[PDB]
């Protein structure tokens, strides 16, 4: 797999959400984000390749996408209600979660 391409999808679609006009554009971007996040959780960062999948480091790496996907879901609930501004403000959580996980 390739964890870097999944972050491309995540970052690119987060910018689509910020500059979106309607709830459909937001829902479509979040949908692509959720798939990318699920695949990203499977891979291993190039800094933890000599550790174990059961080690605390990999457990914490996967934990970050548990949180990230929960926040995608937070925004999807709102987009599904047609609440554009609310869904955009909920996706701002993803900025923080992204910023906190660049290890």
């Amino acid at each position: 797999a390739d964890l870097e391409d999944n972050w491309e999808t995540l970052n690119d679609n987060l910018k689509v959400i910020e500059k979106a006009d309607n709830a459909a554009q937001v829902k479509d971007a979040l949908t692509k984000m959720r798939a990318a996040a699920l695949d990203a959780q499977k891979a291993t960062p190039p800094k933890l390749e000599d550790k174990s999948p059961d080690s605390p480091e990999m457990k914490d790496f996967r934990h970050g996408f548990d949180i990230l996907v929960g926040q995608i879901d937070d925004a999807l609930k709102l987009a599904n209600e047609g609440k554009v501004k609310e869904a955009q403000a909920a996706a701002e959580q993803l900025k923080t979660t992204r910023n906190a996980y660049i290890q």
Epitope: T31, K32, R34, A35, A36, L38, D39, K42, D66, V69, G70, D73, L76, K77, N80
Partner: antibody, heavy 125, light 109 residues
Framework: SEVQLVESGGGLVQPGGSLRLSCAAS????????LHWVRQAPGKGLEWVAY????????SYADSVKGRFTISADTSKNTAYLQMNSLRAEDTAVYYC?????????????????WGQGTLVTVSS | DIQMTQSPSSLSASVGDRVTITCRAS??????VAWYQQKPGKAPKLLIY???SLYSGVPSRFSGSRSGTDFTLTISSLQPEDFATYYC??????????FGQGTKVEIKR
């Protein structure tokens, strides 16, 4: 010692009428799982209808039933309901209810691991 | 609206044959694909989840695989009790569920 779901309330309803289906859970708590309705018209495939989170209150519906169906839950009796209004002939189907665990964790990944036996709704004059 | 394109719609195979059912997702759903077996008159039963995990209690002659957006259900050694209609399903999110059109499997004898 076994999880099961039991749909009831199915039967004949006149066109334009209303009918309420129930999905009674046993062996597990509806607060712990999302609950979904999937229907199958005679000879046709599976069509997802609606879902409810009993814990949060969040819902969603298929475009084909949006504005006509309302899904709800009563946690005290461990049961979900599908209230179907303005029924039409093309709503005739076996209606199944199924559980699907919450994110995060293996329960989310197991999708519809338990289904009820299904109840037949017939829309006809 | 994510589409699952399932093929073939029907097939007939002898006991012992290897049977392959395919499902194409219109966009990425990660590995959030399940396969179900439905006997006539009964609720679907889960066979495979997360594209390739064998559900507990399902015989190991059933298996699944993912390749990008291409998903495959394989029955390695078809048994007479395997006659059914099989469905793929993508479950990327609670509100997005769609199913494949189904594959009716008949037994030749």
């Amino acid at each position: 010692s076994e999880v099961q779901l039991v749909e009831s309330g199915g039967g004949l309803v006149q066109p334009g009428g209303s009918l309420r289906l129930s999905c009674a859970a046993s062996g597990f708590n509806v607060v712990d799982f999302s609950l979904h309705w999937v229907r199958q018209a005679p000879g046709k495939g599976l069509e997802w209808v609606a879902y409810i989170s009993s814990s949060s209150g969040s819902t969603s519906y298929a475009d084909s039933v949006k504005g006509r169906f309302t899904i709800s839950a009563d946690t005290s009796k461990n049961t979900a309901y599908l209230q179907m209004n303005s029924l039409r002939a093309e709503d005739t189907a076996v209606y199944y209810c199924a559980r699907w665990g919450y994110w995060p964790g293996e329960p989310w990944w197991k999708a519809f691991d338990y289904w009820g036996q299904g109840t037949l709704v017939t829309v006809s004059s | 609206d994510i589409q699952m394109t399932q093929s073939p719609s029907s097939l007939s195979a002898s006991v012992g044959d290897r049977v392959t059912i395919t499902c194409r997702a219109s966009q990425s759903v990660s590995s959030a694909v399940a396969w179900y077996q439905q006997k006539p008159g009964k609720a679907p039963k889960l066979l495979i989840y997360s594209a390739s995990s064998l559900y507990s209690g399902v015989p190991s002659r059933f298996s699944g695989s993912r390749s990008g957006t291409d998903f495959t259900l394989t029955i390695s050694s078809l048994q007479p009790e395997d006659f059914a209609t099989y469905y793929c399903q993508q479950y990327l999110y609670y509100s997005l569920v769609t199913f494949g059109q189904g594959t009716k499997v008949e037994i030749k004898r």
